[PDB]
């Protein structure tokens, strides 16, 4: 049974925060995976991307652990990407699913040409890098699909992007760096100032300040 | 792997302070490896080995 | 090297004859057959074994 150990967990468990977007708006870190299970939960879906054996030399042979790269997310929503390394592959997969739940970001989705209906693509051209792998996303017309390699395609489909042109330079064969670069490119959708986000920000209370009187009862 | 995990979860649920299950042999292939399915505390040396840890 | 062994295993193999079975299916009815095998009336069963032609 969940017993929350942070102020944010005590607020989420007691129904005091009504969405994940409040926790995103006030930029707060998430330290418990059951917050993501509380909000998204039954709509989240994960895929293990790679199980990678790594080997430390000792004087008695080689010591072997297994890293697992787990992508996760809600189609139309959010995406995570976690890497855990352990002595057992099931333990690595479970720790990687926890780590992929905790690194869940929101993706901003825009339109290619005319603004009719719901968003479908990236808002602008965003890039993302991880150690000599660049990934660039380009906005695409309604219905072209993700035009990309198979490994960023899982992350872009889990994000809820329906169509996108892509390009990758670098040693994309190292799958962890290629996963960790398209995740970086779809993180920069919500930190790019387009001219509709030029309105002056109207501030509201932090969750820690709004519920400072319920948080002393516990 | 699954058959040792079932026994280990039973004998950790039943309140033992720790256990250790080892299956040695050629469980797959022709060279014979071992396993080490361990959990909790486990004392190896001294005299309390006689009455606290139960081996078979 | 020595050319004397050539077609050693090809001529050494015990000659088993092919067993007569029915004419398979062809074309659109074959595609219907393999759609009916995989998609409609897929079995609620031991999933993740999704390896048709699984021996054991």
């Amino acid at each position: 049974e969940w017993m929350p150990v942070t102020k944010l967990g005590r607020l989420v468990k007691d129904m005091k925060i009504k969405s994940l977007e409040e926790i995103y708006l006030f930029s707060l870190p998430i330290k418990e995976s059951e917050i993501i299970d509380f909000f998204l939960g039954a709509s989240l879906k994960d895929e293990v991307l790679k199980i990678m054996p790594v080997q430390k030399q000792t004087r008695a042979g080689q010591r072997t652990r297994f890293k697992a790269f787990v992508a996760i997310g809600d189609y139309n929503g959010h995406v995570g990407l976690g890497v855990k390394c352990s002595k057992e592959v099931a333990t690595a997969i479970r720790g990687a699913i926890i780590l992929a739940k905790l690194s869940i970001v929101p993706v901003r989705r825009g339109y290619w040409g005319n603004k009719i209906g719901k968003p479908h693509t990236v808002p602008c051209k965003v890039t993302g890098r991880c150690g000599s792998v660049l990934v660039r996303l380009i906005p695409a017309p309604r219905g072209t699909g993700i035009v990309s390699a198979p490994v960023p395609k899982k992350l872009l489909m889990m994000a809820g992007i329906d169509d996108c042109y892509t390009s990758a330079r670098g040693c994309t064969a190292t799958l962890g760096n290629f996963a960790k670069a398209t995740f970086d490119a779809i993180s920069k959708t919500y930190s790019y100032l387009t001219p509709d986000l030029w309105k002056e920000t109207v501030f509201t209370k932090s969750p820690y300040q709004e519920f400072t009187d319920h948080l002393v009862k516990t | 792997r699954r058959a040792c995990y079932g026994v280990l979860r039973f004998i950790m649920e039943s309140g033992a302070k720790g256990c250790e299950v080892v299956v040695s042999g050629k469980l797959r292939g022709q060279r014979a490896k071992s396993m080490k399915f361990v959990d909790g505390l486990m004392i190896h040396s001294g005299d309390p080995v006689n009455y606290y840890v139960d081996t078979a | 090297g020595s050319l004397a062994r050539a077609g050693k295993v090809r001529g050494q193999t015990p000659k088993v004859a092919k067993q007569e079975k029915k004419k398979k299916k062809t074309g659109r009815a074959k595609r219907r057959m393999q759609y009916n095998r995989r998609f409609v009336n897929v079995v609620p069963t031991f999933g993740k074994k999704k390896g048709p032609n699984a021996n054991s």
């Binding site: 293990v48 199980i51 592959v89 997969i93 | 792997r1 469980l27 | 993740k48």
Partner: peptide, 29 residues
């Protein structure tokens, strides 16, 4: 068990096959 057969035979000649089988078990349909 694909977990055990991968954790044992990831080093042998049968590594590619047991990785194929482990991804089949994990991903699934």
């Amino acid at each position: 068990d694909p977990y055990e057969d991968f954790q044992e035979n990831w080093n042998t000649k049968h590594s590619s096959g047991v990785t194929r089988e482990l991804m089949r078990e994990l991903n699934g349909g």
